[PDB]
Design a protein around this ligand. Structure first.
Ligand SMILES: NS(=O)(=O)c1cc2c(cc1Cl)N[C@H]([C@H]1C[C@H]3C=C[C@@H]1C3)NS2(=O)=O
Lengths: 491, 147, 49
């Protein structure tokens, strides 16, 4: 059953079209086949989109797959909600719940809010690109108002190429006025690779700055530039290279010939192409389940004008979309589930931070669950709160009356307390204030030399340091050492 | 449908309105078919041919009014249906003149909740006790919000 | 390698000990913040030059 479908593709999405050709025969043909009529046409001209759409409707196909641009989304929704033709896309999500649209890209906005709350910022800037829409901009401003943030949003997208070396300099020098330290980028990968190069030219990737890429292919762009910098860069991935089917597709992809499939003979891949590959899986599962329920999709006639007045559609496409919303398979992004509308639910996004060795993950974020870090504690060097032993003595070391409500080093008060705070300030270490157990100053044992009290805590490696009223003697220099004396006294 | 029908009728000069969702459709058809279109609707952003538009621009005068009243901190309530061009415009001047801007969408609120949602909105404004409000809507939403 | 590891901000300072000071590449660290000086024996302003 070679079923007629329609495919829309931009002039330059070669990696995605080759990945579609891969997924075409990657799994099929125990059954129905597909009839892809491909239209390598533009996406900005909605008249061109209309011409291609009425061409594939004069063909009279059962489902159309492709991309869309923000200047075309209204056209696609307006024709699909009219003519009941189910449309599937990997592009940016729609704003309103529209019928007959299945969309492959997960949300980003709740994840990004989660990330901002985790890093706990208050003031930052937000460079955005107009041509990807402004839904995330509208989303960040509301929560900025509620969460008392201070946002300096700036459009950057409409800058031409011929001034695109000094525009950015003027921009970041204006950012130097408030002395900005925290940037969120939100662009296509091309604008990302331009802006990172201009940042690295003007020298703004030292320790102190911090950056967040709002995309899905975090490592799909270039990162060897600012890897060794000093700045800290984090982003998001939906294609995790550790999994079995993932690495299987990695090996299968790398072994292919570049000449047959352009942009295929590499190691990594674009998330867009990954979603295209998963779209083939969903689209085949649809007709699989229809032949399971044995529901015939016989058109039983030709289509006609897309300008039919009034045009009347056919509700077996409604049942098609109804079966489409129930598909649940595993893919390159992982598990998929749909809503009642065509938006993806039941997804998981990995938080990816760049380090010196390279990218790594620190946690995941779910469709319902918040940021769960994976407890990856590779911090091998922790400055230990050193052992500080003493004894209670007025006014050297005294309790406070509210010691139960207070905690630890706050509980103790006195001359030695102030002195230990000064020493730790001058030497930069961490400490914890402890008490000797037996409540003695300490002397040695007869016939066994067992130094008790505060002596044996330092002799026997128990305690680390002792800021305390201890008297320098002759018999104490042999086992421990003393600084210069700080306060004189006598019997 | 209407545009193809009247071009089949062989119109010499097309006139009508447009919302924010048909604007690309109309400019795409007119850029292709080279038919002179006239409108009183909201002005566009990119320079598009064959589109004559009667509604003058507003952004420069509104910024000038802001500078005349000499403000620094204010709220800005907008609707999406007329566009977001002025919202994009005022934020650049906010970045330049270091203003404290709070912008909030209002246009998605359905009619069944427009007694308490607005109340929650103004209470959230009173969390900061705003004093300077720029509304940016149509006449219906203006009459609805002033009440 | 300096411009990769990010050591051309304001604060640093550099001196090239050659004769073709501009004969090498300088568009890299031109906009940096660091200050670079050198030496020339071929002055482009002269007539025969
Ligand atoms: N007046 S006092 O007992 O509190 C006191 C006693 C002493 C102080 C400082 C003070 Cl304020 N510093 C001296 C040290 C300073 C230098 C000279 C000797 C030691 C090194 N030790 S000390 O003689 O023990």
């Amino acid at each position: 059953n070679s079923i007629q479908i329609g495919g829309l593709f931009p002039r330059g999405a070669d990696q995605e079209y080759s990945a579609f050709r891969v997924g075409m025969v990657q799994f099929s043909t125990s059954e129905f086949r597909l009839t892809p009529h491909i239209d390598n046409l533009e996406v900005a001209n909605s008249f061109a989109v209309t011409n291609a759409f009425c061409s594939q409707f004069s063909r009279g196909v059962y489902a159309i797959f492709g991309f869309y641009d923000k200047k075309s989304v209204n056209t696609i929704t307006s024709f699909c909600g009219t003519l009941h033709v189910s449309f599937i896309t990997p592009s940016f999500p729609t704003d309103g719940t529209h019928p007959f649209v299945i969309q492959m890209r997960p949300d980003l906005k709740g994840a990004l809010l989660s990330l901002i709350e985790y890093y706990q910022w208050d003031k930052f800037a937000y460079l955005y690109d107009s041509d990807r829409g402004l839904s995330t901009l509208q989303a960040v401003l509301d929560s900025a108002a509620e969460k008392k943030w201070q946002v300096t949003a700036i459009n950057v997208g409409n800058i031409n190429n011929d001034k695109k070396d000094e525009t950015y300099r003027s921009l970041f020098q204006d950012l130097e006025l408030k002395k900005e330290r925290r940037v969120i980028l939100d662009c296509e990968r091309d604008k990302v690779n331009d802006i990172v190069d201009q940042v690295i030219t003007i020298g703004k990737h030292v320790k102190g700055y911090h950056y967040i890429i709002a995309n899905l292919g975090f490592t799909d762009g270039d990162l060897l530039k600012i890897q060794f910098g000093g700045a800290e860069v984090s982003g998001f991935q939906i294609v995790d290279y550790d999994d079995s089917l993932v690495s299987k597709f990695i090996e299968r992809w790398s072994t292919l010939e570049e000449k047959e499939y352009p942009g295929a003979h590499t190691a990594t891949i674009k998330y867009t192409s990954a979603l295209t590959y998963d779209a083939v899986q969903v689209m085949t599962e649809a007709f699989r389940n229809l032949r399971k329920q044995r529901i015939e999709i016989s058109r039983r006639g030709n289509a006609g004008d897309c300008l039919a007045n009034p045009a009347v559609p056919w509700g077996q496409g409604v049942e098609i979309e109804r079966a489409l919303k129930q598909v649940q398979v595993e893919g390159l992004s992982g598990n998929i589930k749909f809503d009642q509308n065509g938006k993806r639910i039941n997804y998981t996004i990995n938080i990816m931070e760049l380090k010196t060795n390279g990218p790594r993950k620190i946690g995941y974020w779910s469709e319902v669950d918040k940021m769960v870090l994976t407890e990856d504690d590779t911090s091998g060097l922790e400055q230990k709160t050193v052992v500080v032993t003493t004894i209670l003595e007025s006014p050297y070391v005294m309790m406070k009356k509210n010691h139960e409500m207070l905690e630890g080093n706050e509980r103790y008060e006195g001359y030695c307390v102030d002195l230990a705070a000064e020493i730790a300030k001058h030497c930069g270490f961490k400490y914890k204030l402890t008490i000797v157990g037996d409540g003695k100053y300490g002397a040695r044992d007869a016939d066994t030399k067992i130094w008790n009290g505060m002596v044996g805590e330092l002799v026997y490696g128990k305690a680390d340091i002792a800021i305390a009223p201890l008297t320098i003697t002759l018999v104490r220099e042999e086992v421990i050492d003393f600084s210069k004396p700080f306060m004189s006294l006598g019997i």
